[PDB]
Amino acid sequence: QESVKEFLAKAKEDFLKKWENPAQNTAHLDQFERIKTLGTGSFGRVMLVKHMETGNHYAMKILDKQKVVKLKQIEHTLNEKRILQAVNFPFLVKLEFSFKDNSNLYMVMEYVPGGEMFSHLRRIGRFSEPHARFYAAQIVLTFEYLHSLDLIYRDLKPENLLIDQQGYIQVTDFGFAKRVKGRTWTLCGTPEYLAPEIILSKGYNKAVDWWALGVLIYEMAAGYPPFFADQPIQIYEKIVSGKVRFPSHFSSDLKDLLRNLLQVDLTKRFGNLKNGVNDIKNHKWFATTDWIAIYQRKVEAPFIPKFKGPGDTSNFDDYEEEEIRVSINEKCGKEFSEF
Amino acid sequence: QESVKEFLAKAKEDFLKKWENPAQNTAHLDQFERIKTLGTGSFGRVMLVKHMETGNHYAMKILDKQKVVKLKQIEHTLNEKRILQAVNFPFLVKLEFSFKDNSNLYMVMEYVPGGEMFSHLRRIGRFSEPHARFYAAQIVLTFEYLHSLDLIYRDLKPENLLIDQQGYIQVTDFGFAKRVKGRTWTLCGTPEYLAPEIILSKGYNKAVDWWALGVLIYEMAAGYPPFFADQPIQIYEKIVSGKVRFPSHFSSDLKDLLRNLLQVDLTKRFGNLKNGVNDIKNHKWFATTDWIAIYQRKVEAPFIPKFKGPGDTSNFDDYENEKCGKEFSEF
Amino acid sequence: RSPLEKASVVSKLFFSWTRPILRKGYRQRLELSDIYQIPSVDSADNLSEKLEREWDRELASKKNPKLINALRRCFFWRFMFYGIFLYLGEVTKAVQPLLLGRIIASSIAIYLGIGLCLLFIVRTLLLHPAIFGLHHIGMQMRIAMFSLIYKKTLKLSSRVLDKISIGQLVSLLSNNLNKFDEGLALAHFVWIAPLQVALLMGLIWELLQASAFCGLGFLIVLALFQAGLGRMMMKYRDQRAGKISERLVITSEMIENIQSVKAYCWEEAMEKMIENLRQTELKLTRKAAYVRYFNSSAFFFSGFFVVFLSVLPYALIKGIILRKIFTTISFCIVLRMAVTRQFPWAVQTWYDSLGAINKIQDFLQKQEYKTLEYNLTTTEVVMENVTAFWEGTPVLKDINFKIERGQLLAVAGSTGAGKTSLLMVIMGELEPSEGKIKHSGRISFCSQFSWIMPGTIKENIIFGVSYDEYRYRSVIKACQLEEDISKFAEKDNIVLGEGGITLSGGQRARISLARAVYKDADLYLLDSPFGYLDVLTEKEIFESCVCKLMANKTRILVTSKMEHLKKADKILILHEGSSYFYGTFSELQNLQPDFSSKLMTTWNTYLRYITVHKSLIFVLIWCLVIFLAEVAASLVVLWLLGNTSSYYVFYIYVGVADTLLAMGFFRGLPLVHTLITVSKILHHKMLHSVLQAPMSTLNTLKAGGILNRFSKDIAILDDLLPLTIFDFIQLLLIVIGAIAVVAVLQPYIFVATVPVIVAFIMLRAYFLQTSQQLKQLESEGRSPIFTHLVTSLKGLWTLRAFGRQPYFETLFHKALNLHTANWFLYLSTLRWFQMRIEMIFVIFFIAVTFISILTGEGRVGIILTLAMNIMSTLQWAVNSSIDVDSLMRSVSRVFKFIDMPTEGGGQMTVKDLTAKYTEGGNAILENISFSISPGQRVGLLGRTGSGKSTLLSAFLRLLNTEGEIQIDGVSWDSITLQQWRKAFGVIPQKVFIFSGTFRKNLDPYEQWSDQEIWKVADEVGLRSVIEQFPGKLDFVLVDGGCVLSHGHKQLMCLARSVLSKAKILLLDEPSAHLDPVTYQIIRRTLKQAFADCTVILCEHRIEAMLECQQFLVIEENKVRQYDSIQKLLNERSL
Ligand SMILES: Nc1ncnc2c1ncn2[C@@H]1O[C@H](COP(=O)(O)OP(=O)(O)NP(=O)(O)O)[C@@H](O)[C@H]1O
Ligand SMILES: [Mg+2]
Ligand SMILES: [Mg+2]
């Protein structure tokens, strides 16, 4: 405690203040480039660009205005736009500004070419015994810091975390989150990280956050997630079943916390009852987990990226294109007053 | 006691006068034969010869002075020579004469027709229990007589024990033996006879001889060493553990005394606590082992060698500027 | 899915689940597939999940691996739930006699009788379900007990796997195979028995308040004496075990050399030696049986004093009503039955459980093998600074091997001289101590020793894979496996059994190569795959797949063949564990051309058991007459007394049925002595019969059955059968005497008792069939689990290579569940039998009680008290009948084994030779004829290598043979075989040597002089061969005469034959068994001394037999004759 609790209080003292002062229309789409496009995204476009004024390489998100309204995911981005605006934590990459246009919006975030570990682990299969811990510690720290902010992440997928030049992983895509206090029935995303209560369709809580990280860790250790089925219905049935077998090569000491993480009993979820993060902070499998020292990021990376320049997208598998010119009318422009 | 102690006192008294007047260069290699090489032994050469002047067959222990200097064993050789030249006990074959040539040195020993008991034990596998006790009694007698002179043999191997025409064992290979009172830090020899105290690289006293004799008895009855391993490091670790399983044929009276003989505690080792050899003498494994009557060696032997003349090598195997002369100044 | 899941509460209480199962079983023979489906909660995969989760949680929790503290969290709630009802029922049974402390006053007692009857129902209800519940808990725990260690089996470190005793794990598994499961019935008895004593002492002080500990001290002293007798019994058993093992070793030696013994005609000496050795063991066994009988009889005898001493103080002090006397008798009966039986059994159960828990907890904690962290991504693998010990001794001398991704590497040197260890270390089987190895990790290996598990060709090829048509076809066609597959009967789906005998060793190697080829991986760690095939086949396999298909990928084949070594991408030759030279093919071939060139249960059975020894009948008559007289005297005493205080105290003599009907100490010892004597007589008869059996039936049975015929059966007959039979007889006599006493009370008892006994007999008969069928099925099925375990032990390295352990886990769980189904079914059937027997007994007791109530105070009290005790005796009697039924199987086997049929000048002439191994088998001769020359040897030539051992055996008629053999005018019929065969001289390839001193080992008949023996041995070259032995001639031939060499053994056999003075001597395989000097000495001795015999030296090589004068050429179904080599070498060989 001591410095840790006071640091959480210092972060909390400023979090709501910027949550109380949203910005709007910080930039226009006239000072960027079209070098490449790292990926498409759920229902939008994204391009790798270079700052015309400064030169700093940065990303440029995009999505159709009608896409927000038609699928009923309009204000879902409205909350996330503010949520990203104030965040201050070493693990994640910040953003500079955003565009406000009559056809689509744009997000000016960092462009770390380190790419998703999903592809590196598809090329690698399974992470080594300490290799997974090296990332999972940052996952624990992120979970603590975010849960302190009175928000539900609802966002933990291998397609949600990227890598930096120094080797630090970083998350993005705040669309799925909700800064919720109390019970709620909202649910979305992919069932690969489905919780039993989420399938059960009841008032959710911050409990499922640990389950998602545990699913992520177990799948990172073996590549194959414990739940795998042809259709979400069969996958949801396996999730309701709650029976799974850990990897044969998996450590039994790691298996203890694995049983703890996926514990179906929502009341007895690991690190949910009274200790909060201390039970995870005391987990045996994280014996070599220097929380504050990894917070200084002095720990050597288990696998560093082979960077070849700021404009290099070698870790990316994209070279494609996309274009648009101009429109005259936004889809529900009255809905877009805080974006 | 009584007569036996009176004889022990006389032996100890005469040993000092013998040690203070050692002989040197008793003969030259000009009155011997070269009929056959009895063996090599250690790092030397052994050959069977016949006295040209007398006719008595006598062994000759040749060894290179360059080997003594290069193997860093020269003082041990001098101590062995003096001790063999001063020894007086019926249990061992005495040394008759010494040769000192510019190429090598020879030592005159008596002809041993009975050969080494190790080969006989390999031919028969396991000796009978009374057959084991028959040799063990004289072994204990000679060891306690060495204790009556305060010397450490530092050598115990199966092949070093010969057999006489009378059937009594014949002692030889006095190389590692030395008359040092107290504790000595030197360590060498056979790993199978390596005590934990010597293995621990500490000062070693006479107490390890009891463990050596116990290992000798146990292996003579068993045919396999109590401590055995593929590598000497594993053999040293097993000896340091000090645990071994007794054979199925092992008698309770013999195995229980072997437990005291092989006790890891050197202070609690049998033959070192308080009485010297009296506790061993009263042991039931020696219930019929006449220590005093064996001084004449009149007991019916368990087995006699098939001697067919001293010139026959049937018991033996059928095989085939001085370096630092200043060091060898008393040979 | 399971029938027991579709069960009502009342149906569950009645345990009627097996009712249709019993209906089928008593009707028709057992069918293994007909077993009901295993319970859902009984799933091994399900239970082991919770067991493992708890074990891991505990292993992480604290610095003490208290496995018991974890399993308590798994079972203690159910254990206490069962124990609550168990203790309640125990309390009810204990207190029930106190309720009898009211009826003695005699109106109102009718309600008391109805309540006492209902107490039986309540107690049975409390008792019966608890046994099944606790036993289900036991079997459930045992399943996971196997499972945890079975999972750990794929976790152990190999460095300790070579050191961990292979038999230690097997013994650990077998020890708790049945003990630990049944060891739960006594579990709560600790929590109850002290409370039982607490209640009983209060009952006694309520009745007495002044005589309480008086009998308690006697009971404690009896327990002390009983416990003390056990140490002496264990000492006697331990003393007997060693001599029994020695006798078994001698018997096994006789079994191995049975044919040579029949040839030598040493059956009488072998039997005499066996009996003489068994005499001392029989004396020890008789002493042990006497001790055991005294200990068992103490429990029955105690009952008299138990009440007598307790009553004597109070009775002398003041008068007491006989009501309290009967009540105290019952209370003391309960107190003794608990004190003498319950406490020690529970203590033993708990101690054994604790020790087993400690052993299991220690076993699982061993250091585990650490898997390599690989398969991520890599280019060409490379090694650097390889150095490590295979256990000091560096198996690698700083070796380094950069293998290109796609290359074909190879190494040569001495076989297994560390190159195999280097391959294992690269594969991750051995942790390198120096340097750093880097590899892709996905790689297969092919151990030199093939590990073929049972299964069809598709199973052996897949080992957890799908059916790939092109890949399987290529593997078959390329590994020389397509032709061998076509050679199979089904040729595609030949399901291999155990042992792998269906295929040749080269076939096993081809299977190994194909199995390696089945999966694509970064490298193929081949280890001399061509090591069992011809050179042409090896070259074909290389050119087709080994050097064509996989060589495009990275490959590392351990090959010392020069021709392939020239084509290798790189070579690595190591000597003394150190690479002398290595590197590129051309560079290594040019750098050292000189090195390159240089290196390159019937009632008849029971009657036969009775009729074995006449003394048994006399002993039985004496015991029966004694029992009848005692019962009659007791009845007379009761009648006279019922129609000064010593007369009242004498009623206690009737009060305890156990002491009243106790088998007198002057009677019981003769029964056990007769049992031991009959067992000895049976052993002698079996030995004599086995000596005479024909070889044709002998070969039909496997030789290991001959060992099993006495290894355990005779032991069971000696130890188990007498004690069980005597206990059953004594209990039955006591029960029958109690019945007669009760019938003497009133003239109505028998009319109801007889239907109860008849129904009990019918129920026992019905239950027996199903019980035996279930027991046999369960015993038969247990073997497959050990078979799978042994297969895993053999294949451990290849399994670790494959990484497909989940399928093996599936198989192990399936087998375990299959055995568990039968086990649970049998246990449930036994529980139903126990419940039904209890119900019958309760009904009979209730009827008798009602009859008595409708009906004199002492008679009523006697009847009630005898009823109050009979239940435990009846239960023990049912258990003893079941035990006798189980034990009778060994006697039946022995009787079947004994019921066997018995076997039935120098010139000679043979004709009409017919022979075969069995009756009408392969015709070894087709009317063959031959003439024996006088004093001249005949060369056994011609079809040498087609089998001459059959003709040699036919020379002694040791096979199923018939024809004509007219030697010296004597025929094969007139002379007894023991006398006819003596003229022949055997020279077997393997010498039979009796383990013992040379005097006995060379002269089993013992009909010669020692001086003549020494003179002949000098003439036979044995005096010097014996001079190196212990002593002179007393040297015992330990380990089958292990000191003697093969040539020395041949010389000994020749000397023994010369001592026998046989007129013939057929030699066989001289140069094959003899070394150079041994063959020379043998030839000199034979040509010198045995020059005067018509020998037959059989040799596969014609050159060895070329010295012979006569020549008998062999051919398929026609043994021709060739008097001279002038035609023999030109026609028979050419
Ligand atoms: N900070 C970043 N720097 C560079 N590329 C990025 C960054 N965040 C995302 N990307 C890339 O943009 C691609 C797709 O855009 P993305 O942000 O994931 O849209 P999305 O709809 O939210 N994805 P998802 O919700 O998981 O289906 C990803 O594959 C990333 O490679
Ligand atoms: Mg997306
Ligand atoms: Mg995304």
Residue numbers in the entry:
A (entry chain G): 13 to 351
B (entry chain K): 13 to 332, 341 to 351
C (entry chain A): 3 to 108, 118 to 402, 437 to 645, 844 to 886, 910 to 1121, 1125 to 1173, 1207 to 1436
Show me the paper's own sentences about this structure.
To address this question, we used cryo-EM to investigate the interactions between PKA-C and dephosphorylated CFTR. The sample, comprising 30 µM recombinant human CFTR purified in digitonin, 250 µM PKA-C purified from bovine heart (bPKA-C), and 2 mM AMP-PNP—known to bind and stabilize PKA-C but not support phosphorylation—is very heterogenous. Despite rigorous data processing, the final resolutions were somewhat limited: 3.8 Å for the PKAI-bound complex, 9.7 Å for the PKAII-bound complex, and 6.0 Å for the 1:2 complex. The conformation of CFTR in all three complexes is similar and closely resembles that of the dephosphorylated CFTR in the absence of PKA. The two PKA-C binding sites are spatially separated, appearing nearly orthogonal to each other when viewed from the cytosolic side of the membrane. Despite their distinct positions on CFTR, both PKA-C molecules are oriented with their N-terminal ends projecting toward the membrane. The presence of two distinct PKA-C binding sites on CFTR provides a plausible explanation for how the eleven widely dispersed PKA sites can all be phosphorylated. The results revealed a comparable distribution of the three CFTR/PKA-C complexes, suggesting that PKA-C binds to the two sites independently and with similar affinities.
An example of a protein activated by PKA is the cystic fibrosis transmembrane conductance regulator (CFTR), an epithelial anion channel crucial for salt–water balance of the lung, intestine, pancreas, and sweat duct. Phosphorylation by PKA releases the R domain from its inhibitory position, permitting ATP-induced dimerization of its nucleotide-binding domains (NBDs) to open the channel. The PKA-C consists of a small N-terminal lobe (N-lobe) and a larger C-terminal lobe (C-lobe) joined by a flexible linker.
